[PDB]
């Protein structure tokens, strides 16, 4: 009882001290939780801190980022690669200890938080992905994916509506493995959370199929594990509410006003006195990290898994090689031929075409939609429906959830095994922006499938109809968007966005049909933008993007026939054309050359490659295509006479 | 129960003959919820098919927009100025019956609907307005606000996240006058339902603090009159649960092939024999159309609420003033000086100044945040909470809401009576996309405010600092983006956002605190972009917004030291300068001189007035200000680095 009172303290004034030092972040809640955080890292959870990427650790997601110290603490005490240095860099430039988690910045973060909702959302697909590798690999005597998912979550993590919808979904799988610890401390940044939170959450989440606990006192470590025992043993994912004192043991405790501030030297003296605690800022007795220490534990647990995949290796020699390379993230040759197109089709079914040649040699490939399967063509030939019946089915029904979508799928991408993509119409990627934008921060390279990107799809209309999306996404940092033009970029398209291990890709399809390209010429996709049909001594460039680029050549024709020579460029992606050498991006826009972009979307941004634009500038309209296509501006014709005026 | 048949498959068919004939739309859930439209308009609600602007009309809010020909059809039938021929117009160009519901296109619609959880979301900012209108304005013996809101919601409007945000707090403020139907068919796109979808949602429902109640049949009138009896009755806004049959009647009955496509003709056919419809398509008996007129009840009912406010305006002469005004939507006097500033101060504090300084003169005016009440400045002087126990504040603790928020703000303002803008951080604008778009295409003037708009914030880290939001939001149609450089453009942002009705705006603050500007020079924000510091025989031009403007002027002072002349400019808003005669903006921007832009955040889109950006394309970096925002590259020496390179 004296160690643990003695490390929790440690983990307090870790917290305490480093936001000291800093004068910029969150004590209050590190102080109330720091009891759970002991619990998790030295008694409940199995992790290697001298290997943060060991498979088969158990995973713990700090969905409350805010609460970082919390997390930097526990890491430095247990024997990660995180010195006493760090701490004492907290926030500063550079540090392994930003004020929120950042996933693959600091060792030991599974996932990059801060955006309420995001963490507890994200750890849905981590433990949908632990479920399924199981399912996938474990076999009579050979246990070699056995792990659980933690999460602690504040209470705006759960007002959060993606939260809601992750929940929902978690309880319609049935995790089983999936353990969330709420802290109840009934404290906002407002206030008294009462203000605007007092619905009875655990009546909500146990009728999403939920099961929940209640802990009355954060510091009843006894009460913490027989909390985490029965949720082990129960076939539901378990959310524990459990009650703690922000700013715990200090004067500012059970007020908002230790949330987000530094306690100040008057309260941390106090607080020092209050615990008991006798160490200066940053000491912490060598006692503790003796108790602490991880690393031996940790090699153990790990060694004992590396042994167990020697025996899985002689008993399963063709499943052992495949879950290496999955775990790996190792993909297999990719096919180099696109399908075979004898006829307009849509980018959307073009894409499905792709998904039907691609999964059966990709096993790791999981793919889904947001209620708009049959409209998505994202259910590959071969995958059947994951479910509780059937936890082998690669292709996931995610509902009417595009944001909890974007957040599973994150997270069954950052568990390592498989690669997920899913999809929606671009103009619902509005629902899950925070998760796109998540995918790109920690670098993971989740696929965005979005189908009807524009006004051509015709009768929804403008609630429908995308305008700004194909912009506001190319604004964003490590976010490719490719656009492919017919079937066969759109084949090459999906080659891209699975090479591409550095962030996420968003792949944008038509609803209507448009017409075939040269599979030779499509290839130019892979170089982002390429001289789709080229002319002797251009007087000028056509460049369009998807389904315009189809407009771009009947516009060249028309130009053609009045003595006027343009090339046209296909722009399937701004990004992969601006990685390109610039010798090759002026070989494809020739400097002094007038250039006419045309694409069905805002014009925004456009002049960065074109002197005019043929674009949208305003919303649709509920109208059948190609009607409501041309009567919106999308004609040869205008096409034509938009570069006529250059000239 | 012979004319409620025969106008409720009136109803029935007028949908299925309008699907039929476009060949596009959902003929489905009309068919199921026929009996529920029927009763709604027929006897249940209070309402103006002459006036659908009368304001103490109760108010219907289809949700589930896809089921548009289910609104067209009882609009039609119950003597709306929706002809015949509109019905046969269906999801044709300019038609008064798009696809999906569409606000100011079709009398009738109250809000536009489509993107699922949208619909159900915005009604609760209708009946809180209804309910605040209420508290604010009646007597005794003078009851001149009092209406129902009632909404149509499909399974999907329940799974997506939004929905149980505007729930919790629905039950949290007890809007008992708020009662949303269910149509519980249990099919979903993807086919059936539970394919995603198995959690209980009315025991959710009641742990938010609703009622819950259920309807075994739609078909049964009674029982349908009875539960809506039931939710008047109590204090607690109500959840129905009604079962039907998508495609009740048809050969593709219980069938995702009834949802979105055409019956065809052997359904169709089938159809009108299984119902007994002899009636050919598009025909209606007169009999029904005698039967549902509701032009007579409906100039009645508003004839006895012009009679209660004469007899208002008698007894409260300035309250009936005060009420009229509102209700018309027009401004009163407002203060035409800004506050007076002494110090660097953050565009934040210096909007909850304005605020102090505006709100007084706007009884109408209610503000709010997401849980960011003291880091958005959103609370103005004079503002107390708004609770149950306290109806009459006009201050709005949302919680970690956002997006519930917009959506909750846009059925405030669009209401009548109130205008609302309630703020979160900029980088949280992407939780509450789909509500802002709602907001730009309904032409809504929801004042959205986002605070922390750039790296500047410090600390907090990339997940929190914005980079591609202020281009992802200026490429939206009708949304006005204002990115006070000061104090004083921050009154003037006020202002131009008070002043626009056509459509939303959002005003951008900083965290940090930024130099003030000359008085009288901020005014030219009025004008969308303006020169700040001219010199003689510019050399060139350095174009900024909001806090970038202070660090091109000090580019200029050091341009200057090397003898370079440079004119800033200030361009707070695009849309705004935009707007402006071209003649100005060539004398904002002479043509032939070299542009240097300044901003914090992705540089796509920039070239439309730039020649060279200075610019951040990349997430930002937990660090200190100013460290972080020189580090990062916004320095004046960058930027007149930048500029050299030009000239």
Do not use: C
């Amino acid at each position: 009882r004296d160690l643990e009172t003695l490390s929790v303290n440690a983990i307090r004034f870790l917290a305490i001290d480093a936001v000291e030092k800093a004068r910029s972040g969150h004590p209050g809640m590190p102080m109330g939780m720091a009891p759970l955080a002991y619990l998790l890292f030295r008694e409940v959870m199995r992790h290697n801190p001298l290997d943060p990427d060991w498979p088969d650790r158990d995973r713990f997601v700090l969905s409350a980022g805010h609460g970082s110290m919390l997390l930097y603490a526990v890491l430095h005490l247990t024997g990660y690669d995180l010195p006493l240095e760090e701490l004492k860099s907290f926030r500063q430039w550079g540090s392994k200890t930003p004020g929120h988690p950042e996933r693959g910045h600091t060792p030991g973060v599974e996932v990059t938080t801060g955006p309420l909702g995001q963490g507890i959302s994200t750890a849905v697909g981590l433990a949908l992905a632990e479920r399924k590798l199981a399912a996938e690999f474990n076999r009579p005597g050979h246990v070699v994916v056995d792990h659980y998912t933690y999460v602690l979550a504040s209470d705006g993590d759960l007002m959060e509506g993606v939260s809601g919808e992750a929940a929902s979904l978690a309880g319609h799988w049935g995790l089983s493995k999936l353990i969330v610890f709420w802290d109840d401390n009934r404290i906002s940044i407002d206030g008294p959370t009462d203000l605007a939170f007092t619905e009875d959450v655990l009546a909500r989440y146990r009728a999403y199929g939920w099961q929940t606990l209640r802990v009355e006192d954060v510091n009843d470590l006894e009460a913490l594990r027989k909390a985490i025992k029965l949720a082990k043993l129960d076939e539901r994912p378990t959310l524990i509410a459990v009650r703690s004192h922000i700013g715990f043991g200090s004067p500012k405790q059970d007020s908002a006003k230790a949330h987000g501030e530094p306690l100040g030297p008057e309260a941390v003296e106090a607080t020092r006195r209050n615990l008991g605690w006798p160490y200066p800022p940053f000491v912490v007795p060598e006692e503790v990290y003796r108790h602490m220490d991880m690393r031996e534990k940790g090699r153990a647990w790990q060694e004992a898994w590396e042994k167990a995949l020697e025996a899985y290796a002689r008993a399963y020699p063709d499943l052992h090689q495949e879950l290496m390379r999955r775990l790996r993230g190792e993909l297999p040759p990719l096919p180099e031929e696109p399908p075979s197109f004898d006829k307009p089709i849509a980018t959307r079914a073009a894409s499905g075409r792709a998904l039907n040649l691609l999964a059966p040699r990709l096993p790791e490939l999981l793919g889904g939609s947001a209620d708009l399967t049959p409209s998505n063509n994202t259910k590959a030939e071969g995958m059947e429906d994951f479910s509780r019946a059937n936890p082998l089915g690669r292709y996931l029904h995610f509902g009417v959830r595009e944001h909890a979508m974007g957040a599973i799928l994150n997270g069954l991408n950052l568990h390592g095994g498989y690669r997920a993509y899913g999809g929606t119409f671009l103009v619902f990627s509005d629902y899950m922006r925070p998760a796109i934008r998540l995918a790109a921060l920690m670098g993971v390279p989740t696929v965005f499938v979005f189908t009807h990107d524009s006004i051509a799809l015709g009768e929804d209309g403008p609630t429908h109809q995308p305008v700004e999306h194909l912009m506001s996404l190319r604004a964003m940092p490590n976010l490719f968007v490719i656009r492919p033009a017919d079937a066969y970029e759109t084949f090459y398209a999906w080659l891209v966005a699975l090479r591409r291990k550095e962030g996420p890709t968003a792949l944008v399809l038509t609803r209507q049909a448009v017409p075939l390209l040269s599979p030779e010429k499509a290839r130019g996709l892979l170089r982002g933008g390429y001289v789709l049909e080229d002319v002797e001594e251009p007087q000028g460039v056509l460049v369009a993007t998807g389904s315009e680029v189809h407009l771009a050549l009947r516009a060249q024709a028309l130009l053609r026939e009045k003595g006027v020579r343009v090339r046209v460029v296909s722009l399937p992606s701004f990004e992969l054309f601006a990685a390109q050498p610039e010798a090759y991006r002026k070989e494809v826009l020739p400097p002094g050359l007038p250039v006419v972009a045309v694409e069905a979307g805002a014009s925004l941004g456009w002049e960065r490659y074109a002197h005019k634009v043929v674009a949208l500038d305003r919303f649709g309209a509920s109208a059948p295509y190609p009607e409501v296509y041309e009567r919106l501006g999308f004609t040869p014709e205008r096409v034509a006479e938009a570069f006529l005026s250059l000239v």
